[PDB]
Each structure stands twice: as C-alpha cells, then as structure tokens.
C-alpha cells in the first residue's frame, strides 16, 4: 500500500529575463554611469564631448568605442575603479542568476504514514477509503 496525491509543480519562472532580480536598482546605476561620465568630462574640462557621450557604457558593456584613455592619469585611475565596479557587477549578476535557478524546491511530500498531518485529523487533509475494502 501507498498513498497517491496531486503533483504540485514548482514552476520554472522563465519570465525572469525581463524581471532580473534587481528590478528597481540598475536604473539608478545607469544614471550613475552618466554622472560619472560628467565627472570625467569635468576633470578634463578646465585642464572630449563624445567621450562623455560614449566610453562610459562601453567599458561596462565590454565594447570600448570612444576617445580612449584621458591624458590625466588620475581620471584613468577613476576609470580603473569604475571598470572594476563593472566587473564585480556582472559577476554578481551571473552568480545570483545561478543562485535563483536551483536554490529551493517547496515541500510537497508527507512524512510517511506517521504524519502529524495524518495523526491529527484536520479539515485540510481529506482522506479516503473505498467502501467494502480490505483496508
């Protein structure tokens, strides 16, 4: 003898492509990209317009199209810590998708014939027995 129940499906949530887990956060990150480009252009202003319009998104998206390195090496150090931030951002993004994939499956199984769900007859666990049976 065993017990048959209904299969509950822990659905895959394939819709996470348009979701992905931040979902309120990367917008202000993209705004910080723009104001960091303004920081670079203002460092190079008094002592390069398209390198403000470009080369900020490209170094985090791994396509470096622009005016390249600034003549000020301090702004080059700022770009260094910037792209290091980009590196840990994309690494953490991959790591948390891999976490979101296979982390948990919700509990469906009963703990055998000595279940406290079974031992205490409650309303939400309706059992059955076919009439005039051996059991």
């Amino acid at each position: 003898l065993t017990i048959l129940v209904k299969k509950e499906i822990p659905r895959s949530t394939l819709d996470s492509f348009m979701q992905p887990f931040q979902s309120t956060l990367w917008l202000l990150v993209g705004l910080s990209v723009h104001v960091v480009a303004v920081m670079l252009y203002l460092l190079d202003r008094f002592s390069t317009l398209s390198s403000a319009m470009w080369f900020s998104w490209g170094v985090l998206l791994n396509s470096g199209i622009g005016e390249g390195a600034p003549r000020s090496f301090s702004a080059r150090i700022l770009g260094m810590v910037w792209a290091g931030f980009a590196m840990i951002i994309v690494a953490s993004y991959t790591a948390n998708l891999a976490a979101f994939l296979v982390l948990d499956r919700p509990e469906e199984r009963i703990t055998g014939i000595n279940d406290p769900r079974l031992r205490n007859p409650s309303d939400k666990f309706i059992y059955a027995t076919v009439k005039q049976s051996s059991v």
Partner: protein, 323 residues
C-alpha cells in the same frame, strides 16, 4: 526468522526441537536423491524447515509449503562509480528557437547596416556582428558613430544577458544531474555476449543453489562461461568485487540489498532500480498432509495484520546509505 519462531512460541501450539543441518546446504536432486535440508525434510528426519530457503517448483512437488512471507528476487550487484557525458554541447543548450533567433538577428539588421552605409562591405559587417555577442577581442572596423554604434551597446547588454544565461544553465545542470549508465541493458545481451564486445567479465554465482538450475534452464549458453566463476562464499565474492576481480554477483536481491545497506561505504550498490529478475518468496517446509500448517498460516496472517515484521526489519534488516 528466529524472532518469527518466537512468534510461533507466541502462537503457543508447538514446542521446539532445533537442529543444524550438516550435509548439503539446501538440497539438490542427485540421481533423484536429495541432500541438504530437503534431504532432512524427506525420510522424516526433519519436519519444519525454518531456514532461509525459497519456495520453488521442484521443491514444492516433494513436500508441503507454507505461505511466503518475504518477497524475494534474483538480481546482481556491482561496485560502480558513475558519471555522465554532455556530448559536445549542452545536450540541447537553449530553446532552439532563440538559438536560431540569433541567426535571425544576424540578418534583420543587415538591412539597417546597408541603409546606414549610404550615410559597402556588409559581409565585413556580418562578421562584425559575429564579433558581437561572442567575446572575440578581434580588431573591428568602426563607423563614424551613429545608431549602429548605439546597437553595439544594445547587443553588448544582450551579450551579457546571453553569457549569463548560458553559464547559469550550465552550472544548473552540472550540479543537478543523475547518474545511471549500464544497469539492465547488458544483462540480456552482454551477459548473453559476455566477452564478444568487451574484455571478459568475471561473473559471480554459487556452486549449489536454485539459481544455477534456473540459469541453466533459461540462459545455459552463458553458464558454461560462468563455470569458471563458482565462488564459494558471499563475503569472498564481495572482496573479489572489491579487488576488481568480479563483474557482478548473481544472487537473491534481499540479501544483496541488506549487505549493500550494510556496506562500509556504498561504492558497492545493487542494480539500484530494484528490478528483480526473479519474483519468488521465502516460506516454511511442512510434511505433506499435515493439517497444522493451516493454523500456522493463520498465525502468519495474524503477524501480517499488525506489521510487526516491519519493526523487526527495523531491528534486523536496516542499512546505512540505502536511503
């Protein structure tokens, strides 16, 4: 079964005359004559055989048998490390629709490229679109800076999404993966061709027993090759399996499951599926036309009516990593 016999003491009708058999293990028809416990149950030397013997056709014809109380079956056991092969891809990596929609997006923006080129080497541009999502680090001709250069950043963001999804799927399945390689397919063909497609397999059986007569009545063409492997002793076969000097040991899988649960590690396992090739039962031998066995079987069903043998199995037949 000694505890079962103590429940026969609980069903108090009989007192005891114990005896340990001394010549022959179970019993074999030798020119009609029977040795073993069958040789004891004939000639009225023994009446009730409580030893772990199976109910069989050539045995039930001689004497009266009881109801079987333990489901038994013949299988094999191996000490096998397992694995899997992902053959040259991720077995069907993505959904194939997006895996060809990559080829669609190679072609939809060729028209945008050939339109903005007037503002032409579109074949160069096509391998620049291949120098897109895959990280190529190859030198790339760039335009004067326009919406195509916008689309480079767009599809670079898409490239990060692409490689992230691929790495996440790859890590997902290469963590979550089952391992079954060669359980039951070879048993009727490789094992029915034991050395014809492979270096030869060291089989595992016993000298005397019902399994030898079964395998000589069903698959006798392999039992001659099996005749080089007639290992006396279950633990000796276990140690020969530990030394790599055995392929698999053919035996009743109740004892095999018990010893596999009671293995030190569990490199040594059963077939795993539980698909026993035989399906028989363990019972008690009675003299023919002895009316007591009816009331004995009534007490056997009395035992069955409360499930004490599951508790004695928790007392006796319980393993370690058989879970």
């Amino acid at each position: 079964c000694i505890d079962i016999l103590k429940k026969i003491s609980k069903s108090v009708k009989f007192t005891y005359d114990l005896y340990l058999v001394t010549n022959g293990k179970h019993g074999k028809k030798i020119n009609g004559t029977w040795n073993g416990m069958i040789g004891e149950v004939v000639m009225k030397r023994a009446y009730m055989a409580v030893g772990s013997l199976t109910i069989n056709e050539e045995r039930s014809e001689v004497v009266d048998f009881s109801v079987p109380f333990i489901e038994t079956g013949i299988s094999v056991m191996v000490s096998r490390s397992n694995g899997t092969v992902s053959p040259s891809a991720f077995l069907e990596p993505f959904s194939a629709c997006v895996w060809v929609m990559m080829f669609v997006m190679l072609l939809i923006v060729s028209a945008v490229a050939v339109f903005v080129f007037e503002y032409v080497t579109i074949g160069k541009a096509i391998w620049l679109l291949w120098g897109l999502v895959f990280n190529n680090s190859v030198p790339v001709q760039n335009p004067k800076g326009t919406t195509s250069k916008i689309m480079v950043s767009v599809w670079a963001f898409f490239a990060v999404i692409f490689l992230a999804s691929y790495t996440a799927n790859l890590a997902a399945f290469m963590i979550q993966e089952e391992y079954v390689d060669q359980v039951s397919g070879l048993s009727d063909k490789k094992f029915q061709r034991p050395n014809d497609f492979s270096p030869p397999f060291r089989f595992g059986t016993v000298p005397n027993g019902s399994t030898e007569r079964n395998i000589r009545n069903n698959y006798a063409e392999m039992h001659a090759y099996m005749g080089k492997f007639n290992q006396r002793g279950v633990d000796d076969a276990l140690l020969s399996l530990k030394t790599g000097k055995l392929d698999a040991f053919i035996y009743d899988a109740a004892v095999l499951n018990y010893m596999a649960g009671r293995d030190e590690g569990c490199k040594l396992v059963t077939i795993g599926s539980g698909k026993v090739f035989a399906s028989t039962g363990y019972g008690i031998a009675i003299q023919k036309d002895s009316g007591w066995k009816r009331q004995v079987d009534l007490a056997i069903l009395q035992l069955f009516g409360d499930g004490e043998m599951e508790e004695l199995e928790a007392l006796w037949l319980t393993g370690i990593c058989h879970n």
